[PDB]
Structure formats: structure tokens, C-alpha cells
Design an enzyme around this catalytic site. Structure first.
Site, PDB file in Angstrom:
ATOM      1  N   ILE A   1       9.122  14.270  -3.693  1.00  0.00           N
ATOM      2  CA  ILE A   1       8.472  14.336  -2.380  1.00  0.00           C
ATOM      3  C   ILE A   1       7.553  13.114  -2.196  1.00  0.00           C
ATOM      4  O   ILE A   1       7.595  12.454  -1.156  1.00  0.00           O
ATOM      5  CB  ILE A   1       7.707  15.666  -2.153  1.00  0.00           C
TER       6      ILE A   1
ATOM      7  N   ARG B   1       7.707  33.482 -10.694  1.00  0.00           N
ATOM      8  CA  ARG B   1       6.803  32.709  -9.844  1.00  0.00           C
ATOM      9  C   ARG B   1       5.324  33.044 -10.054  1.00  0.00           C
ATOM     10  O   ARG B   1       4.480  32.141 -10.102  1.00  0.00           O
ATOM     11  CB  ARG B   1       7.181  32.907  -8.371  1.00  0.00           C
TER      12      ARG B   1
ATOM     13  N   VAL C   1       0.537  20.795  -0.775  1.00  0.00           N
ATOM     14  CA  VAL C   1       1.952  21.133  -0.800  1.00  0.00           C
ATOM     15  C   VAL C   1       2.295  22.059  -1.971  1.00  0.00           C
ATOM     16  O   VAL C   1       3.284  22.790  -1.914  1.00  0.00           O
ATOM     17  CB  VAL C   1       2.813  19.868  -0.886  1.00  0.00           C
TER      18      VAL C   1
ATOM     19  N   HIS D   1       3.942  30.343   3.979  1.00  0.00           N
ATOM     20  CA  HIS D   1       5.070  29.489   3.624  1.00  0.00           C
ATOM     21  C   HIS D   1       5.655  30.063   2.345  1.00  0.00           C
ATOM     22  O   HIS D   1       5.067  29.933   1.270  1.00  0.00           O
ATOM     23  CB  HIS D   1       4.588  28.056   3.404  1.00  0.00           C
TER      24      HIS D   1
HETATM   25 CA   LIG Z   1       8.342  25.772  -0.731  1.00  0.00          CA
END
Ligand SMILES: [Ca+2]
Ligand SMILES: [Ca+2]
Ligand SMILES: [Ca+2]
Ligand SMILES: [Ca+2]
Lengths: 305, 305, 306, 316
Positions: free
Chosen positions: D14, D94, D124, D181
Site C-alpha cells: 500500500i 483476527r 489504515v 470497515h
Molecule cells: Ca481491510
């Protein structure tokens, strides 16, 4: 009159960047082709979403078949094994790609990146049957970008206001022409006379330019962002009929006293492909280095057969 | 942060195009100033709506007061009567404008367009008190755009791939330097040697360049689109710290053997204004034409006072 | 491919702006056509130099001959007299232009600007024989740019994040649709309910939108910069196959209950010209206003016909 | 005057795309910062050459020191664990990454507080709505100067998929995905427009079906997984979304963009970050727009926030 179709034969790191830039510039629909299964489809999907951010409308698709070359306006070849032992293997890849170009998109503009470019571009020219004005190799735009940039940071000017010429071949025999360096159109020698940059500083920059790919490989990986941008500059000049003067590998037909070989020289790229091949009026020293570059290309071409 | 404030002192034909281009490029908020009542407000309103089409967010306002110079980052002066009899009149306009700049925006970057530029820019420098690196005149960017363009059309290359230098003064004594013309960084002489353009054609282009303003006046009016674009190129280099090499009227302090006068020469424009003043290493014949240009500026400067 | 060829039939101030923007965007070669000898060549020469500043390569030429319509990809018509007395005069001009389009570029994409646009575009359609997907009139992109901009000022957001719909006709009978105003895609009503903007403010903005041309003229200026930018947005969507949803005057064939007439409605502009005609699902109150707009267009068309 | 300084904390895939786009748009000088030796300098060098092709003048440099945060105008944080170090795929989930990435936010936050306490920060690191708040707490940056990526990226998928069914310019579809998100992202069907026109009008005309949309919604939520399953990974669109946010800030565009921002009563929530439309300009988050959600939409918003709270509790 529909969008240009641009097929990227090879969807590695350079391919990904190219696709990104094509969407940013709304240059055309894109195919990311690769022999690796699934990966090009994933990259294509990721890139396609950027149409929203870019206010563009370019399709981006993945492919695992050369059949997607059908109707291509521009084909960019980065595929190949990654030294001398690879030459005959990459020749076979050029035979394969060339045969697919011949049947699917014989009127496409072809840009070859596969190293050693000056050899590989001629092999693809021969196996694809495309006209000499519709196939070129990446070299000088990338190589001079390094030289221009490094000089610009010493002189504190806009990078693109430095112009420079590197000719002959893309690789260790590249010919850096000191006499053809300008800053805002002014001969570099004037800046040397004024003590704004030294001959020693310049020699260091020349050495750095030649070895940039090696420098970056040692730090990280084979360069891909600047190669991609250089390729797109070339592709855009074609697609938009800009007629930019860009240094690329092109078929020599007597220029510099050479023929039946490709070498790096300034050309004009427009809607008719290579519209002009510009032969620099080299002095004997420069010419000698040019001849050395061509000899090395001829040596490697012999091994490729 | 926040947006640059750009004040256009003069909202005539050049001003109108400048405001249009500023919005297109999202360069900063705009003030269209003029002595004529209402008109700058009407042009501002019309121009402001283009923010939608441009995806920009630049305010565009009209003004009839110099108080709107407060907080200006860039000031562009096109105002003035539109020959030698006008010099003392426009000197008074430069005294007025200079006084308000000194009061309202002494740290602004000032671009003077009022003809004869090389005289008027120095008058504004003296009356405004601004530093010599923060005030320049329009000249070479405009003049060379014509030369570059005409050559590009003869050679069939991208217009901006032609670089050229016109120095000394903006007007009939402008000095066109054949030796400093390049095409994709390659000296123009190479193309002449190859019979791609003749010296007679080149001479005709030189004459056409000097007389372009007159040619356009005889067809329509005093040019405004190209002047506007040239001015915005200069302002953009400053505002975005591009460090472009651009030919502008700047204070000479010994360069070319001249001082206490402004003349056209390549400069580097970035965030600190005129960051570098580049003195071309002219031969004796080129230098003699330069001296003639300066002589004329000095002649008109005497009449202005 | 070689560049698109864009022919500006009419090289007034609007044409100059269009030519300037075409070079800035490298959108194609440009012909400044007009019915006066020298002026279009003067403007063309001036604009051509901007290729250097723009890093573009678009030819810009003046023309005094309709023969230069040969090979045109886009034709933008701003020619005509510059009220109801002018209608049959400008129809006569549309007859001539239409004849030369028919002869020289029968499949070019035609954008008509000559006022009143919804009348003049249909007249040119009839006199040129071009397909209905290849001829549109300027209206909504310009009118909504005003409405969008003024709302954006009040709410302090990016102008293009305001979207809005003005339909029916370009002129005093334009139909402003409060129900179809959004801010960042959010209905404007949310901002009204939140007291960020009032109904009174919006009404004033509506009035100002309708009268914007008059306001600019009363300020001793002439509106041509935003009209030029609006036309180029339309031409660009066509030339680059963007498929933008843009409000333009187009042939109605049943939409809104109307036919045999051009009116303002959102369309999709791409490489096939008008690719879609979008009929807003208007209520009875909005429909009635739309009908008034069409009635006025019909009234003026009757005065125009010979 | 001079250019903005943009520091990319994390120089992975990214980061690389971001640096490229920053030079293309001449947005600012770039620092590619990473713990990995050599790599950021190599990427920086490669990218720096593109100034020539782009007619830009942005410095691009690599860094292995937090000292380069000094003078930063924008700081973009992509750094963090994406898998448990040394573990196989079957023995971590996660949630296990939460306390590890908390420690990363503590470190980065401390250096932001010391070196650039008023920089505009874009987070992010996943899950964004948790990690952006953690960084906020550990850095002390003002609430108008710190946001998280989410809505711009998620809506780009939804906008794009709808546009290709309807055959319209992708950006002429506008849509809102809010709350968080991640898998609890809230797709607001009622707020989707096409050239400003309610999507329902197109459904009424049979130009797209409720079933098609439902498939599009599911595809939107699972796009990251779809791309991973295709032996690729999503970094190009994430990078472009981040740069759209940073550009609105740096150019004072005042775009309406959906980002993770501190809620102070909006939607009935406080002391938590969540996705909602904001206006981004020279003063950072200039406005926080509270959508007037109906019951079904509000319920899903609340579920997203509950999940963020659940994960935040594990992170602490
Ligand atoms: Ca993501
Ligand atoms: Ca190489
Ligand atoms: Ca002049
Ligand atoms: Ca009108």
C-alpha cells in the site's frame, strides 16, 4: 470509436504499476495477462475499483490466455525468465508471443521490456511479423530518467527540465552522452563552467545511473515503478499522437553505420508509431561506445538462436 | 494551509483567461480586480461556476478596491494604458499599485505584464519595495512559446519538446538565440544539417515570432490566451515549488555586464521566488544584441520618469 | 488512432474558451469556424501557442468554410443572432448549418448551444438528418452548475459534491427539482432538517439560478466561461467514452408524456452518443412544471418554423 | 510554500502505491518509513525517478527512524501485524492480532506525540475503527486531525460493481457504507444514487434487480477475501482511497468522504470511532455529517459499533 485496448503480457510488479497508471490517465481498457493462474484476475479486480477515485472508465480484466490479445491496440511485454543461459529460453517465449501477436493483433503497437531488451525486441519483431515502426524496446526513457533526476537534485531544478541522452543499448553498455545534457535547454557545460556542478560529481552520477538497477536490487528488488512510468509515457505518446521525442530501442537501417539490429536512439512516437528515427551526430568517442553496445547486442542475439 | 490567494490586478481579456485556468488547476482563490465597476464581479460569478465542471474548490471574487490585496500570495498586474507617451502615465499606475502592495501584501510574489514589461516591472519593484527575488515580468515564456510552437509544426514533434531561449527584452528588441534551440534535447542544428528544416524557414519563423502580437492584432486583438497560460505557468512554478527553468524579466546585477535594470533571462522559479538567475554564456555577437535590448529598456525607463 | 476533430461552428468568446479548454485537456484538434474572415484565425493562432504550456499536441485552426466539417467527430454550434423575433432568423441559420452537416459529417456528434436551445436543437436535428442519439442541446449541465455551486457555498463543501437536477427546458421555464438535490450523495432535506440551510435560502438560490445569466449581464459581463466548460464536459464524456450522467436537451419519445420535441433530461453520454435517456419518476406537481416548459418550447418552435 | 511532507509509516504494498500516486499528483515530499532495512530506500529511489515522467518535483526518501516524523503534515499508518508471527494459518484468528497491534499503536502514537503532535493522521491498520482510536488515545492528536480509512474504499467497490451493471461512469454512482470497515460494514441501499438519481428508480425500470443488488452487496463485503482467494492482494484501491482523503485535506477541497472519525453523540454513540460521511479540508475534519438513518439502518450501525467496542476491549 471505442477505447484503446492495452494488453499487458506479464502481470508482475511492472504490470501492476502500468495498470494503475493506465486507469489514472484513463488511457484505455486493460488486460493483465499472465501464465500464473488467478493472480492477474485478482490484480485486475483490485485496480478496477480505482476508476471511482480517478473519475475514469477503463475496464481492467485478468487473463490466462493469449487469445485476449484479439483487438489489442497496444501490447506491452514484460514476461520472461529472469544470464546468457536464459537467452535461448526467452527466445522461445518471444516465438510464442510473436505467433499470437501475428494472428490476434498484427496492427498493434508493441513495447518490449524483456531483458536484454535490444535482443528480445528484435526476436519478437522477427517472430511477430509486425512492421518496424510498430515495435520498440524500453531503454532510454528509463535510463535517462535516472540521469535527469540525479542532475536535477544537484542543480536544484525541476527534474524534467534536465534533458539527457543515453543510447546504444539498455544495459551495462549504455552510452551516456555528456555533450547532450541540457538544463532548461542550456548546455550542461555552462553549469560546469560556473561551478554549479563538477566533472567529478557528474562522473559519480554517470556511474550511479549505469548501476541503478543493481543498486535497487541490492536494496529491495528489481525496479518496477520507474520502468512502468517510462513504458506508459511511451504508450501514451502513441495513443494520444503526442509526437514526443523519446529514446527507445528501434530497428537500425543504416543509422550509426548499423543494420539488421535494434539499438537505443531518439525517436518520435505518434499515432503512426515510430514516425521518425533520429540519428544523433555523434563524435568518434561517442560512436565508438555506440559500436561497443551494438556488438554486445549482436553477441547475445547469436546466443539466443 | 489555507489555499493561496491570487489577485489579478486587471480583469480584462488576459485576466479572464487567468481566472479560468486557475480554477481548472485548483491553484488558489482568485480576486479579479479592476477600476471598471461591476464587470469584474460579473466575470468572477461566471468563472466561479466552473468549479463544478473542474472538480475544484477555488473562490472567484470581483473587486474594485486595492484593499483586496490583503493577504495575497501572488499578484499579477495586467492593468495599464495601451506609445512612448503612455510611459509616464503607466509609471503613475505602477506608483499607485506599488503603494498598495507595500501596504497590503509586501511578501507577495509579483508578476508584471503591463507593457513595456522590462521597464514597468522595475518601476513596480522600486515603488512597491518588494525584494528582487519576488518580482518578475512576463516575457520569454510567452515569446518562446511562439518560437517553440512554430518549429514543432515544421518538424512534426510535440510542441513542448522544442526548447528555445529568447532574452534581453520582451518586445521588438527580443534576442532570438539559434544556438540555444533544442528538439527533444537535441540541438536544432542537427535537424538543419539533415535538411529537415532550412535556415530560410528558420529565419521566417524568427520574424514571425517577433511580430506575432502584431499579426494577431491585425486578425483580431492583442493576444490573451497564450499570455494568460504563460503567466499561469510561472505562477504555478512558484506556488507548487516546481523549480522550473523559465525565461522572465528579472533584476540584473552584473549578468551580461548590466545592472540596475531588468531584462529577460532564464531563472529558476520555486517557493522562494527567483531562486536562481541563469546567465547564458553568450558569444560577442549575441551579447551585442542583448546590449541593444537593454539600451531600449533604459531609453524608455528615462521617459517613464 | 488519430486525434478527434472538434469543429466549433461559432468562434465568439464561448468558442475561445472551448478551444482553450480543449488544448488544456489535449482532447483533439480544433477548428474555430466563423462567418467573419480574420477573427477565427487570430484566436486560433493565439490558442495554438498554449500547446507548449499545456504539454499538448492539438492543432488549432481558423476556418471560414463549412468544408472543414469534413472529418468532424464533434460539432458545437453557437452561431446565430443574439427576442422571439430572432426565432425564424436563427431557424434559417440552422437550415444552412444542417445542410452542411448532412453533406460533410452526417454521423458527427452535434452539440447545439444557440438559444433557445430546446427549439434550435430540434430544428438542427430536422435540417441535418443526424440520428437522435447524435444530437443534443446544452442546458442542464450549465443550469445545475449554478445551483450546485451556490448550495456548496452555503454548506461549505466541494462544489461537485452537490448534485442536482434541472429539467424540461433551458431558459426561464427550467424545472428545478428540490427532491433530487444531494450533498455527497445525501438528500438535501437532511441538511434542511438539521438547520444547515433553510427553505427560504434554497428558494433564493433557486431564483438566483434561474436569473444567473441576467445577473451576469447586469454586472456588465457576458456569461460564456461556465457555458464553455459545460459543453466541454459533454464533449469529453462522448470522446473518452466516460458514460457520465449529464442533463442535456434530447429527443423525447414518450418520456414525461411528450413526443416530437426536445427537452432537458438526464442522459448517458458515451462513444455511442446518447446511450440512455433517463426519465425521472416525477410526481404530479413536478410533471406540471415540466409540461409548462415543453409548452413554451412548442410555442417558440411554431414561431421559428418557415 | 514549501511542499507538504507526507510520511508513510509502513512501506509495504500500500505504501509503495501511495508514494507512486503522490508523485503522479505532485502532492508532496514523501518519506517511506519502515522497520525493514534497505527496502524503503530502494522503493524511494525507484519512485523518485518518476518525477521526470510525471513533470513533478516531489522528494521521495526512505527512512528507518521516527525522527523523520518531524515536520510531517500528513502521516499515513499502514504498519501492523496481518498474521501472528511464526504461527501456521490454522492456529491464529483476527482477534489475536488486536493486542499486538495495540502495542504498535502505542509506539507510533508516542513518536507522533513527540515529533508531529498536530499532523493529519490517516490510519489504515486493521481493524481500522479500533486502531484509529487507539492511536488517537496514545498520540493525543486533536480529534479533527485523525481519521481512519473505510468508506472511501468500501464504497469504491459498491459504486464500481453497480456502474458496470448500469453502464455508467463509475464515479456517477454514489453510495454510503458506514459504521465500520470490516465484515459489519453497513451498506445503505436507500442512499445509493446514479447521477444523483435514486437507485430505486433504476430498479423500478428493471435496469437492475433487487437480487442483483443483493449479490453486489455480498461481493462488496467480501471483496478483500475474493482478491486474496485469487492469489493477489488488495493494495491498489486502498492506496488510491487513502490518497483521495489526503488530497482533499492538502488541497482544501472539502470533499464529502466517508471515514472513521470520533463520535461524540452522533447516532447515539460516544467515545468510539465509526464510519460516517465527513468533510475534509485544510482544517482536517471540518464537519461530521450524521445520516438520518431509519430503524433497520440504525440497528446495523449499532451492530458495527458493538463489534468495534468488542475488539477494542480485547486490544486493551
Ligand atoms: Ca481491510
Ligand atoms: Ca534492465
Ligand atoms: Ca507584448
Ligand atoms: Ca442561455
Amino acid at each position: 470509436a471505442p477505447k484503446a485496448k492495452i494488453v499487458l503480457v506479464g502481470s508482475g510488479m511492472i504490470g501492476g504499476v502500468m495498470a494503475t497508471l493506465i486507469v489514472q490517465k484513463n488511457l484505455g481498457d486493460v488486460v493483465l495477462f499472465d501464465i500464473v493462474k488467478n493472480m492477474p484476475h485478482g490484480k485486475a479486480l483490485d485496480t478496477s475499483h480505482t476508476n471511482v477515485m480517478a473519475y475514469s472508465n477503463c475496464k481492467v480484466s485478468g487473463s490466462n490466455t493469449y487469445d485476449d490479445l484479439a483487438g489489442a491496440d497496444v501490447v506491452i511485454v514484460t514476461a520472461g525468465f529472469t544470464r546468457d543461459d536464459l537467452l535461448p529460453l526467452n527466445n522461445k517465449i518471444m516465438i510464442e508471443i510473436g505467433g499470437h501477436i501475428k494472428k490476434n493483433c498484427p496492427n498493434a503497437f508493441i513495447i518490449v521490456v524483456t531483458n536484454p531488451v535490444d535482443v528480445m525486441v528484435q526476436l519478437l519483431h522477427q517472430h511477430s511479423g509486425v512492421p518496424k515502426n510498430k515495435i520498440i524496446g524500453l531503454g532510454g526513457v528509463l535510463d535517462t530518467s535516472r540521469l535527469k533526476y540525479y542532475i536535477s537534485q544537484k542543480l536544484n531544478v525541476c527534474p524534467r527540465d534536465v534533458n539527457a541522452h543515453i543510447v546504444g543499448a539498455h544495459g551495462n553498455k549504455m552510452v551516456l552522452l555528456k555533450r547532450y545534457i541540457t538544463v532548461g535547454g542550456i548546455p550542461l557545460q555552462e553549469f560546469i563552467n560556473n561551478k554549479l556542478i563538477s566533472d567529478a560529481e557528474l562522473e559519480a552520477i554517470f556511474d550511479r545511473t549505469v548501476n541503478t538497477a543493481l543498486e535497487i536490487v541490492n536494496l529491495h528488488a528489481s525496479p518496477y515503478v520507474a520502468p512502468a512510468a517510462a513504458i506508459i509515457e511511451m504508450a501514451e505518446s502513441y495513443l494520444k499522437d503526442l509526437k514526443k521525442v523519446l529514446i527507445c530501442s528501434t530497428l537500425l537501417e543504416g543509422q550509426y553505420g548499423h543494420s539488421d539490429i535494434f539499438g537505443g536512439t531518439p525517436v518520435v512516437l505518434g499515432a503512426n508509431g515510430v514516425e521518425q528515427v533520429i540519428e544523433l551526430q555523434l563524435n568518434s568517442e561517442e560512436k565508438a561506445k555506440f559500436d561497443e553496445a551494438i556488438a554486445e547486442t549482436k553477441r547475445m542475439k547469436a546466443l539466443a538462436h
